[PDB]
Ligand binder design. Sequence first.
Ligand SMILES: CCCCCCCCO[C@@H]1O[C@H](CO)[C@H](O)[C@H](O)[C@H]1O
Ligand SMILES: CCCCCCCCO[C@@H]1O[C@H](CO)[C@H](O)[C@H](O)[C@H]1O
Lengths: 62, 62
Amino acid sequence: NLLEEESAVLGQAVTNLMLSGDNVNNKNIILSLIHSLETTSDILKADVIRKTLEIVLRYTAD
Amino acid sequence: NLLEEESAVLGQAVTNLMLSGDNVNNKNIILSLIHSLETTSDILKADVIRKTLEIVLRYTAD
Ligand SMILES: CCCCCCCCO[C@@H]1O[C@H](CO)[C@H](O)[C@H](O)[C@H]1O
Ligand SMILES: CCCCCCCCO[C@@H]1O[C@H](CO)[C@H](O)[C@H](O)[C@H]1O
């Protein structure tokens, strides 16, 4: 499925925010994804986080 | 991971809303999850959607 892996990454960011008791909003999702992107060395996993970040950025902007 | 499968379901609901051009908010996520729950006959998959719905409900209620 187009966007399947991205979905899972996005869903994890949302649950992670809820677990830390933070607000689920665009800013915090972005910061969480950027944090994930910066802490992954696996370029294949990095690709998935980057696409997820892009989709959130475009949804946020639009 | 505890909450791993729930994460993926929640992430899918969020992407599905963005694809249909709808607002990403609590109401619409809940409605999307209820729709998924009502259209799944696989009781193992249903269990995951039900847990995801519960988590969103409890986060929403605060
Ligand atoms: C409205 C919000 C716009 C967000 C645009 C997402 C960032 C653009 O995508 C960028 O494209 C290039 C490769 O093609 C760069 O080298 C980056 O790797 C990539 O993130
Ligand atoms: C504040 C929002 C509460 C919404 C509760 C979601 C559905 C609750 O229903 C049930 O709760 C029980 C626990 O009390 C059981 O353990 C069940 O697993 C759960 O489905």
